[PDB]
Amino acid sequence: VCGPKKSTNLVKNKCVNFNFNGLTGTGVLTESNKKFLPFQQFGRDIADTT
Amino acid sequence: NQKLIANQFNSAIGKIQDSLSSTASALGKLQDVVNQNAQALNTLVKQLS
Ligand SMILES: *[C@@H]1O[C@H](CO)[C@@H](O[C@@H]2O[C@H](CO)[C@@H](O)[C@H](O)[C@H]2NC(C)=O)[C@H](O)[C@H]1NC(C)=O
Numbered sequence: 001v002c003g004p005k006k007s008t009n010l011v012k013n014k015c016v017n018f019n020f021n022g023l024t025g026t027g028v029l030t031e032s033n034k035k036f037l038p039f040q041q042f043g044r045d046i047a048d049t050t
Numbered sequence: 051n052q053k054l055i056a057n058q059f060n061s062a063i064g065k066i067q068d069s070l071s072s073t074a075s076a077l078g079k080l081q082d083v084v085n086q087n088a089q090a091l092n093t094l095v096k097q098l099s
Binding site: 046048049 | 092095
């Protein structure tokens with residue numbers, strides 16, 4: 001259930017201000033080999049950051 | 051006794067190598083410092099959660 005927000009394209013390997021389903025932060029988005037399970041939308045660090 | 055002394059010395063050095071290469075705890079005093087610092091940082095980061 002998400003608000004009336006228009007999504008844009010995703011740009012990789014550059015510093016961007018991102019918003020994924022309401023989750024925001026600043027960082028570089030890159031390809032990964034992390035095996036998220038079918039029900040896992042987010043992963044976390046030790047600091048509980050994304 | 052120069053020959054004896056030199057031989058005992060050389061032997062003693064070989065013993066140092068045998069101890070250091072096999073006993074991990076031999077350098078516990080330095081490893082402990084590293085461990086304390088690692089814990090301090092891990093504690094600091096975990097507090098962010
Ligand atoms: C003092 O002790 C040393 C050993 O620490 C003696 O030297 C050894 O003597 C035996 C024979 O009895 C040899 O098989 C060993 O190879 C020798 N060891 C070394 C390192 O050379 C030494 O003879 C003793 N001296 C006295 C006066 O008793």
